[PDB]
Design a protein around this ligand. Structure first.
Ligand SMILES: Cc1cn([C@H]2CC[C@@H](COP(=O)(O)OP(=O)(O)OP(=O)(O)O)O2)c(=O)[nH]c1=O
Ligand SMILES: [Mg+2]
Length: 579
DNA sequence: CCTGACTCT
DNA sequence: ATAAGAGTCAGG
């Protein structure tokens, strides 16, 4: 049905100043991945181009990098990064259908053009999986079949842009797309392609020493159990703990006895073996994931790892990080924290600079709930995580250990996001009565927060969705469910999503503002990672003084709230030192 | 292939 | 039944 030219060479009419553009990368991980085909749809017609041809054509390369030639795409970051690996700069992306779909409804989980097309009853395009196949069968089809698919995807983007933009505008999300998510996409592309350098010699030595330690811990566990078994098997472990050793069963799941960390910690008064097992499972994860798993994805010639920041995945507007995940590198225990010594600057005489928003979601909550006491506290520049810790453990601001503040931080966020007396009791291993009391007092100190949380649940029931500061939405169709469990989970999403999502809006805006400030001040410094409310950069050592002023300022000023935003920062020779 | 571990925000 | 949002891995 759909006519298109299977071109042998680039022509002028393919180089119009507005086009839908498909630069096709089949591999899920697009770093240094093949570009298999290109499609262009514009006012002059529909074109398929072979990448060997087009990417070596100086005019097409020129067009790609010409910011005044506007392109509409789906997942422009994937294309931009794949092109960077081919030594080509992509500019002028003015519409991204993936990001537009994501903003309209994140629950749709849109991850191909066909799925976004479904949102407007557009059915003249196939899903990628149908065309390429799955798993071991995944392959690029015969050229005519490939060309039609890419053209159909380009035609879809061409026809769907206006309908999607119209609906975003109706929702007050058009700027959220064009001014926030789309510019962020190009920044994330830069960060991913840059990568982070790894000290493989240090990491390999850590791994050798870890293997030795695991063996020792392992044997000690076998001695304590009176038996060899697979400690990494919750099934086998459950038999040892609850049948052989006859320890109390505190919890079961659908598969059998729970051996969760929470459960094992509570069993410590019964048998010392549970502490050893908890240590073993920590060590085993360090080895499998942060030594072996990490070394697996290091590019050997540059020693860099290149994460992918998924910008259209989370239901709240956060990013996630995959292959590897660099947003869950250990920090809480010194043993694991040492992994961060293996993440180093990519040039000699450069340093790692890390900045972190202080009490971020509590500040956002203060602004949104308009809780006068919480607002007062932050205008007063107080630390609410520390105050809660003194309350919980009997101590004062002097005797608050970093571990103390950590445990208290979990209690603060637990309570505002709706933890029960049961959950708080199980968490601090205190009586349910004491836990209930603590929650009651908390909401007495911050009654605006309590009111806000009651009101936001009711609003969500009336409207069917909640919204963030920059107009991001999450729909919650389950929130009027007659079923208690289903309804209760949805109510808690109403309590959390606006706060976590507004905090995401803020750091996203901060990243955009920060790059504009780095370019104008012509600094060599550049972003490496985002970790939800943290930005990690690397820079020549000479730029540290300028960053110490620049970075906190830009982050604190990204939005203006009813309370101040506050950023902490550190720098050093490795990520570990940036503390 | 899922579940239940450990990891972070 | 019992704070929220994420990813990876070994075992099965
Ligand atoms: C740890 C944790 C965190 N969160 C959310 C809510 C906060 C943000 C930021 O994490 P951070 O530890 O920096 O918190 P922040 O308040 O910014 O603390 P700092 O002042 O930076 O220490 O993540 C949560 O919901 N539940 C948790 O158990
Ligand atoms: Mg923080």
């Amino acid at each position: 049905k759909m006519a298109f030219t299977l071109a042998d060479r680039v022509t002028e009419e393919m180089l119009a100043d507005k086009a839908a553009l498909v630069v096709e990368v089949v591999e899920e991980n697009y770093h240094d991945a093949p570009i298999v085909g290109i499609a262009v749809v514009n006012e002059h017609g529909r074109f398929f181009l072979r990448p060997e041809t087009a990417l070596a054509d100086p005019q097409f390369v020129a067009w790609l990098g010409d910011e005044t030639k506007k392109k509409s795409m789906f997942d422009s970051k994937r294309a931009a990064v794949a092109l960077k690996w081919k030594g080509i700069e992509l500019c002028g992306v003015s519409f991204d259908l993936l990001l537009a779909a994501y903003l309209l409804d994140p629950a749709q989980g849109v991850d191909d053009v066909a799925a976004a097309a479904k949102m407007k009853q557009y059915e003249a395009v196939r899903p990628d999986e149908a065309v390429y196949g799955k798993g071991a069968k995944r392959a690029v089809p015969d050229e005519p079949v490939l060309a039609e698919h890419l053209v159909r995807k380009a035609a879809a983007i061409w026809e769907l842009e206006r309908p999607f933009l119209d609906e975003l505008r109706r929702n007050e999300q058009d700027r959220l797309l064009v001014e926030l998510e789309q510019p962020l996409s190009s920044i994330l592309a830069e960060m991913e392609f840059a990568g982070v350098k790894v000290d493989t010699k240090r990491l390999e030595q850590m791994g050798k020493e870890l293997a030795e330690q695991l063996g020792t811990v392992e044997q000690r566990i076998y001695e304590l159990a009176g038996q060899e078994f697979n400690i990494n098997s919750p099934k086998q472990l459950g038999v040892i703990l609850f049948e052989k050793l006859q320890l109390p069963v505190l919890k079961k799941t659908k598969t059998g006895y729970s051996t969760s960390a929470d459960v094992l910690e509570k069993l410590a008064p019964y048998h010392e073996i549970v502490e050893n097992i908890l240590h073993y499972r920590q060590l085993g994860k360090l080895q499998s994931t942060y030594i072996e798993g990490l070394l697996k994805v290091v590019r050997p010639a540059t020693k860099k790892v290149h994460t992918i920041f998924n910008q259209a995945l989370t239901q709240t507007g956060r990013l996630s990080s995959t292959e590897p995940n660099l947003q869950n590198i250990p920090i809480r225990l010194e043993e694991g924290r040492k992994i961060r010594q293996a993440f180093v600057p990519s040039e000699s005489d450069w340093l790692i600079f890390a900045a972190d928003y202080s009490q971020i979601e509590l500040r956002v909550l203060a602004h949104i709930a308009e809780d006068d006491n919480l607002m007062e506290a932050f205008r007063r520049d107080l630390d609410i995580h520390t105050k809660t810790a003194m309350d919980i453990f009997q101590v004062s601001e002097d005797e608050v250990t970093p571990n103390m503040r950590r445990q208290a931080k979990a209690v603060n966020y637990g309570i505002v996001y709706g933890i029960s007396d049961y959950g708080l009791a199980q968490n601090l291993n205190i009586s349910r009565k004491e836990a209930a009391e603590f929650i009651e007092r908390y909401f007495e100190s911050f009654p605006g927060v309590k009111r806000y949380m009651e009101n936001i649940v009711q609003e969500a029931k009336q409207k069917g969705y909640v919204t963030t500061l920059l107009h991001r939405r999450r729909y919650l169709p389950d929130i009027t469910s007659r079923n208690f469990n289903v309804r209760s989970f949805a109510e808690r999403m109403a309590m959390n999503t606006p706060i976590q999502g507004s905090a995401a809006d803020i750091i996203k805006k901060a990243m955009i503002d920060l790059n504009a400030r780095l370019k104008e001040e012509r600094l060599q410094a550049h972003l490496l990672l985002q970790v939800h409310d943290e930005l990690i950069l690397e820079a020549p050592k000479e730029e540290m003084e300028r960053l110490c002023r620049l970075v906190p300022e830009v982050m604190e000023q990204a939005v203006t709230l009813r309370v101040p935003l506050k950023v902490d920062y550190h720098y050093g020779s490795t990520w570990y030192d940036a503390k």
